[PDB]
């Protein structure tokens, strides 16, 4: 994934087959994004004991 911002606009690129990404979408916002976060995935059975 590429996620960047420029002049009010937000741009997303993605790939699943291969390393270079292709264009997914853009979105006008008018504001500046300042933070991100990756959420914790509360699963049940993915761990080392599983």
């Amino acid at each position: 994934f590429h996620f960047y911002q420029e002049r009010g606009v937000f741009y997303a690129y993605y790939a699943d087959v291969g390393m270079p990404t292709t264009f997914l979408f853009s979105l006008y916002l008018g504001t500046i994004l300042s933070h991100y976060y990756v959420m914790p995935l509360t699963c049940k059975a993915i761990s080392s004991n599983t």
């Binding site: 002049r7 009010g8 606009v9 008018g30 504001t31 500046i32 300042s34 933070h35």
Partner: protein, 99 residues
């Protein structure tokens, strides 16, 4: 923080002149415990949300005046021009973006 509206006429157009930028943990309400220690020029305080940080106040002590809370942003961010101390930093609008 409850910007409700600007009372204007029917066909008034509003324009700004001073735009300010803050961080994303900014709270103008003071701490509700350092107000329980000061006397002179006591501030207004409340509860700030989960992640924000209150306004800092110095505990100043002199020979003419006792323990007083010397906090920032005095008189106002528009006219306080020692502006490395009030968090509302002045900005200028960029292309494509709003104030």
């Amino acid at each position: 923080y409850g910007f409700g509206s600007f009372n204007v006429s029917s066909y008034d157009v509003v324009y700004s002149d001073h735009c300010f930028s803050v961080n994303s943990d900014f709270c103008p309400c003071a701490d509700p415990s350092v107000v329980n220690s000061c006397v002179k020029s006591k501030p207004l305080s409340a509860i700030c949300p989960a992640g924000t940080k209150y306004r800092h106040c110095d505990l100043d002590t002199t020979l003419y005046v006792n323990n007083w809370c010397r906090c920032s942003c005095l008189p106002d961010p528009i006219s306080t021009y020692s502006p490395n101390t009030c968090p509302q930093k002045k900005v200028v609008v960029g292309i494509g973006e709003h104030c």
